[PDB]
Design a protein around this motif. Structure first.
Motif: not given
Lengths: 140, 457
Positions: B318, B367-368, B372
């Motif tokens: 992140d 956003s899973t 990423k």
């Protein structure tokens, strides 16, 4: 099939185009301008308005050595290098980002949503951990 | 400043020194850059200090002298005239062989700190360390603290000195691993910090409502993990059959470490990062104890540790800073675990790449965790952009057709070109017979699909 125009059936001269150009030719006289002109010619054609482009940027180590040597400077051939917004040696990452952005700015301008561009640059864990251990040590 | 202190030190009054040196240490406590106009005087003061420790003095005077010397020894230039065998023997004598006395612990702690500073800064001290046999004495001191209390500081700084010596020299590293019994002793230390009570040969009893750890136990564990990483650096080169039982206990201890929390949310990340760093040196064939219990549950096994590792990696992605030193160890460990075992690979495949149901979006946008990992595949760095592709390539049984479904040819072109296969093919390894795993909606939408982009127009 995929066409290889660098300077599943693969052929050398359609669904995708594979284009490769050496990134350490800026000093040689220049060639990088010719590569950018050819890329902008192929990307903006109308016969190929739905095909994507896969871009390969090889010979990274030679560029690293050339920029670390300091004999020849980028700004002597690419005056736009100055006044460039900030994103190994700090004088290599900036050069790599600048070279990538030269190609990227051509693509973003037109053709948005009908085709795309994919740029790629062409034990380590123990060495990484040992170096991290050395650098982070704090004296009592 | 140093002139009056040197004069009053040469005077010899016991009470005056304990005040003057204490005041000097109080004034200078957070200084790390020194100017060259004050060198000579400082140097003289240093020598004067070493001249007073020979005689018998009260304990407080010794503590004050050691505190001042610790501050002075930060600068590298002063140590050159004052690195001699006679001087080092005094520090070793102060540090060490009966622990019955209780008021002499601070002297030991301060002497160990001074030794750490001197050994790291200078170069001749590392050469004298071999001559004086420091490692064996350190190990004996460690063994002498098996059952006693009020011993945490001595153990922490002993482990710190061992870590420094192992890091900076190779002969001492070879002495610890193959002689002197380095692996068992250090392992025992960890087993004493976590308070492990064995239920089976390689299983431990874990309670969910367990109290959190303490700061001192956390520090001891961190130092032990660093020292154990330096000891076993060259373990994977040659492996015998008589070492498996020793590595399996270490793997079980690390698995118990991965399932507890520290005092704050910032120390827990450091503890788990050090555990992950150590776990990359154990031979792969001894890592099955990570899923040892037979009761997240898969195929009648316990899989909490793998879930913890996955959450660790997802939270590390992140923040967008320093991917090279933050994502290489954990991804390498996960790939190595998945290559050699069957339950771990299937669990991770079901957790990361569920059956496909969303076809009207590109793989990069989202956003899973799959999104990423797909975004990471086009990066300027080479190590990150190769390891992130290999992790996803393993889960798909090294088949190109199953990789192009989830990611797309555009994102996988780099990995395909690196491995020498740019067309339909398979990897060298063979895992098991192919099966069917396709969702119904995808079967409807397959005829109208875009292979290069990876979604439906």
């Amino acid at each position: 099939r995929l066409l290889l125009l660098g300077a599943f059936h693969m052929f050398d001269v359609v669904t995708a185009i594979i284009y490769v150009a050496a990134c350490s030719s800026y000093n040689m006289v220049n060639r990088l301008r010719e590569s950018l002109d050819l890329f902008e010619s192929i990307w903006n054609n109308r016969w190929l308005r739905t095909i994507s482009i896969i871009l390969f940027l090889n010979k990274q180590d030679m560029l690293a050595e050339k920029v670390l040597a300091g004999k020849s400077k980028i700004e002597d051939y690419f005056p736009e290098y100055a006044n460039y917004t900030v994103p190994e040696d700090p004088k290599v990452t900036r050069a790599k980002f600048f070279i990538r952005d030269l190609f990227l700015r051509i693509s973003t301008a037109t053709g948005d949503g009908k085709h795309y561009c994919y740029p790629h640059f062409t034990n380590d864990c123990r060495d990484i951990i040992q170096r991290m251990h050395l650098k982070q040590y704090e004296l009592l | 400043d140093e002139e009056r202190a040197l004069y009053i030190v040469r005077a010899g009054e016991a009470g005056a020194i304990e005040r003057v040196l204490r005041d000097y240490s109080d004034k200078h406590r957070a200084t790390f850059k020194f100017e060259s106009a004050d060198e000579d005087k400082r140097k003289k003061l240093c020598e004067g200090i070493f001249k007073v420790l020979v005689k018998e003095v009260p304990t407080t005077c010794q503590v004050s002298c050691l505190e001042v010397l610790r501050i002075l020894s930060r600068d590298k230039k002063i140590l050159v005239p004052v690195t001699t065998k006679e001087n080092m023997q005094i520090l070793l004598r102060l540090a060490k062989d009966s622990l019955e006395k209780v008021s002499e612990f601070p002297v030991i702690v301060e002497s160990l700190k001074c030794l750490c500073n001197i050994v790291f800064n200078s170069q001749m001290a590392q050469q004298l360390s071999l001559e004086l046999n420091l490692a064996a004495k350190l190990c004996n001191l460690l063994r002498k603290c098996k059952d006693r209390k009020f011993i945490n500081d001595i153990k922490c700084f002993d482990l710190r000195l061992l870590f420094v010596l192992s890091l900076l020299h190779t002969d001492i590293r070879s002495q610890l691993r193959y002689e002197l019994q380095g692996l068992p002793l250090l392992t025992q230390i960890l087993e004493s910090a976590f308070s492990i009570k064995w239920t089976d040969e390689y299983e431990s009893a874990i309670d969910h409502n367990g109290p959190p750890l303490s700061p001192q136990e956390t520090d001891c564990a961190i130092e032990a993990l660093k020292a154990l990483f330096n000891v076993t650096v060259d373990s994977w080169k040659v492996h015998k059959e008589s070492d498996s039982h020793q590595f399996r206990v270490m793997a079980a201890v690390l698995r118990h470490c991965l399932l507890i929390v520290g005092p704050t949310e910032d120390k827990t990340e450091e503890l788990h990062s050090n555990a992950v760093n150590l776990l990359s040196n154990v031979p792969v064939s001894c890592l099955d104890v990570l899923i040892c219990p037979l009761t997240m549950v898969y195929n009648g096994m316990n899989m909490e540790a793998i879930h913890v590792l996955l959450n660790f990696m997802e939270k590390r992605i992140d923040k967008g800073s320093s991917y090279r030193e933050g994502l290489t160890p954990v991804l390498s460990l996960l790939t190595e675990c998945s290559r050699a075992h069957r339950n771990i690979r299937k669990f991770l495949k079901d957790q990361v790449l569920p059956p496909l149901r969303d076809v009207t979006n590109r793989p990069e946008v989202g956003s899973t965790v799959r999104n990423k990992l797909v975004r990471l595949m086009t990066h300027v760095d080479l190590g990150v952009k190769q390891i992130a592709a290999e992790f996803l390539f393993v889960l798909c049984k090294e088949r190109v057709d199953s990789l192009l479904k989830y990611t797309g040819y555009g994102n996988a072109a780099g990995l395909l070109a690196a491995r020498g296969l740019l067309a339909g093919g398979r990897g060298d390894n063979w895992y098991s017979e192919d099966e069917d795993t396709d969702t119904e909606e995808y079967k409807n939408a397959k005829p109208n699909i875009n292979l290069i982009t990876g979604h439906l127009e």
